[PDB]
């Protein structure tokens, strides 16, 4: 006893909401797609294969759950979780005058059982030396204390920390490095007289 | 109390249902722990015993049981720098390495006295 | 090279956490040995080959329980059955050379 059931194509309404049929990622089951699509290299006398049992239609990723209708329907409900951006910080000139420190943090994604990526531990700290309160000798000492990490043409100091395992630990180490450099740039020891 | 678990399973019997949507299929797996936490951060589930940077970088606190003015400090500063520049190991493993060196040098006392440099 | 410069470098090393006192390049091998992960401890090294014993045991248990159907093992068993029916089987342990 073999039973043959007709697919959803004969029952699909022309005004039916498509995200209701394809809300999330699907393997592109031809039983729920009323669109006759032909994929594959045709024959000298033939045509591209039909959608039924087409391996090439399952090989390729489907964006049927990401049609513009579904994109709008999803983005409309996402207005509640987001916040408003301050319009007083549109130009970077005032952004540098208010928040001079830039914190570059890397984050990676990958499909699989593992999430740990050793490239994620690096934390970059970029500080513009023209927005601080260093004096002349303090700046001249900070230059020779940081070495090549300070770009003289761009007037920016870059501290790239990777010694701590955790990203938050590297962030704390970077802010400690900035603090200890700003503190040591002022101490005039005995060897600075020579 | 086993009766509390008996009530909890009877609550779950009417709470759970076969999945009617892929959204629910992801919600249940995210609440249980199968799905990842979005946005995907590469440090989810690893706290490193709640340690900070002062437990990793600053390791001079463990070299007090060594001669300061001898070559032992000159040898151990390199080990301290290497352990501070090692994001792969935890704090306890570095403490165990320091203790291994401590007990090795404290067990081998005749060789340091024979070498000509006084070590304790 | 000046005294002010060498003092500045000695302070920069102490602040950044590097080796402050001057050391020869040969003594930095023990620095690198702890600064980097050893070869035998890397995951790509110590987890090179998966558990082929687990693979084979799981497949055989499923085959004997009636879920997996190994065509290659069935072919081996059929060939061994035909060989033993023809008359050339595997001798018993201990009677091959003497007996």
């Amino acid at each position: 006893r073999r039973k043959a059931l007709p697919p959803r194509t004969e029952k699909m309404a022309v005004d039916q909401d498509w995200p209701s049929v394809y809300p999330v990622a699907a393997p592109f089951k031809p039983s729920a797609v009323p669109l006759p699509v032909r994929m594959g290299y045709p024959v000298k006398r033939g045509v591209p294969m039909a959608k039924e049992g087409n391996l090439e239609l399952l090989k390729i990723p489907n964006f049927l759950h990401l049609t513009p209708v579904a994109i709008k329907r999803h983005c409309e409900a996402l207005k509640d979780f987001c916040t408003e951006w301050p319009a007083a910080l549109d130009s970077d000139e005032k952004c540098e005058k208010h928040f001079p420190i830039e914190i570059d943090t890397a984050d990676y994604v990958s499909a699989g059982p593992s999430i740990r990526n050793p490239k994620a531990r690096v934390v970059t700290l970029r500080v513009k030396l023209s927005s601080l309160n260093l004096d002349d000798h303090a700046k001249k000492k900070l230059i020779k204390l940081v070495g090549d990490r300070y770009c003289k043409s761009t007037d920016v100091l870059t501290i790239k920390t990777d010694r701590c395992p955790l990203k938050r630990q590297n962030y704390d180490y970077a802010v400690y490095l900035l603090t200890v450099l700003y503190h040591e740039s002022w101490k005039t020891e005995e060897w600075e007289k020579k | 109390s086993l009766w509390d678990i008996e009530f909890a399973k009877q609550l779950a019997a009417v709470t759970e249902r076969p999945f009617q949507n892929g959204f629910e299929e992801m919600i249940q797996w995210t609440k249980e722990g199968k799905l990842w936490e979005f946005p995907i951060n590469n440090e989810a589930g690893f706290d490193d015993d709640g340690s900070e940077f002062h437990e990793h970088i600053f390791l001079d606190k463990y070299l007090q049981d060594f001669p300061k003015q001898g070559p032992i400090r000159h040898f151990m500063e390199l080990v301290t720098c290497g352990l501070s520049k090692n994001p792969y190991l935890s704090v306890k493993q570095k403490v165990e390495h320091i203790e291994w060196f401590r007990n090795y040098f404290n067990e081998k006392r005749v060789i340091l006295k024979e070498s000509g440099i006084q070590l304790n | 090279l000046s005294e002010y410069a060498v003092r500045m470098s000695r302070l920069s090393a102490r602040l950044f956490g590097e080796v402050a006192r001057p050391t020869d390049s040969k003594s930095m091998k023990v620095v690198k040995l702890f600064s980097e992960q050893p070869l035998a401890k890397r995951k790509e090294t110590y987890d090179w080959y998966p558990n082929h014993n687990t693979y084979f045991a799981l497949m055989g248990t499923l085959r004997f329980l009636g879920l997996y159907r190994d065509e290659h093992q069935d072919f081996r068993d059929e060939q061994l059955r035909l060989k033993k029916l023809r008359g050339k089987g595997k001798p018993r342990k201990g009677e091959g050379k003497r007996a």
């Binding site: 400690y176 603090t179 200890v180 503190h183 020891e189 060897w191 | 940077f53 002062h54 970088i57 600053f58 001079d60 | 003092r7 000695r10 302070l11 102490r14 402050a20 006192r21």
Partner: peptide, 18 residues
Amino acid sequence: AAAAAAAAAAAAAAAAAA
């Protein structure tokens, strides 16, 4: 030769690095 004294614990307690 000559070695300069560096305040390690002092800097740690000042910058919360102890």
